[PDB]
Design an enzyme around this catalytic site. Sequence first.
Site, PDB file in Angstrom:
ATOM      1  CG  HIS A  53     -44.642  12.010 -65.431  1.00  0.00           C
ATOM      2  ND1 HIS A  53     -44.577  11.713 -66.781  1.00  0.00           N
ATOM      3  CD2 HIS A  53     -44.528  13.355 -65.331  1.00  0.00           C
ATOM      4  CE1 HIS A  53     -44.386  12.835 -67.459  1.00  0.00           C
ATOM      5  NE2 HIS A  53     -44.348  13.844 -66.605  1.00  0.00           N
ATOM      6  CD  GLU A  70     -44.297  17.485 -66.346  1.00  0.00           C
ATOM      7  OE1 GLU A  70     -44.949  18.564 -66.320  1.00  0.00           O
ATOM      8  OE2 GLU A  70     -44.562  16.556 -67.125  1.00  0.00           O
ATOM      9  CB  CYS A 121     -42.213  10.737 -69.191  1.00  0.00           C
ATOM     10  SG  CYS A 121     -42.439   9.186 -68.282  1.00  0.00           S
TER      11      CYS A 121
END
EC number: 3.4.22.39
Lengths: 203, 11
Positions: A53, A70, A121
């Site tokens: 991620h 994030e 992401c």
Amino acid sequence: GSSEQELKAIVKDLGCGPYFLGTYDKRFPGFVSPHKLACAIVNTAGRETGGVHWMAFAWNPRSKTCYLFEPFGFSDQRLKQVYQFEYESLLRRSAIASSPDRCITLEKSTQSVQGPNSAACGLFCCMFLHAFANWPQTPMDHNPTMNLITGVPNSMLNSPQVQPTLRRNQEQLYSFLERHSPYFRSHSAQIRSATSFCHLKNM
Amino acid sequence: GVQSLKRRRCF
């Protein structure tokens, strides 16, 4: 799929070249940047495991601010429990190297822009870094780039109520990248498929 | 965009 060795090309297309340190795994040392704007894309995992991620860190030495974007906006505790990821060390090393007073303001996202089954992401991180490069005092929101997408409380990440918002965020992300990245445009279909909104949905 | 929390940290 996700995004691999692609961010670099996209981030360069987006005009972040003068500030971009590169892509790192969880061992990112931090910033040694007492005078210049800097940023990086950082994985939750170590290179040894492949990459899980992506997140964005950015450093503004004039405002004394370290940004963490994030895309799910998890708490520190959920980053540790979901991803075994801790950024205390890199934060400390950054402040020791970059701040005359060994202090900084950590500013971190508390909201999700990414769907829980999405593999976009890395692309969201690229979008944030365009915002940083252009509005280094207000990269999280109230700027033309991040005004295109809408965060939701991280507690509601899996709520059916918010899924269309997060899908629309992903549509705006892709269209943003079409408008601003020749690399994205030339790999448009392949990237959309590998990063899709329900890409990681359990069967 | 996203809302954010701010924390002063000194090391």
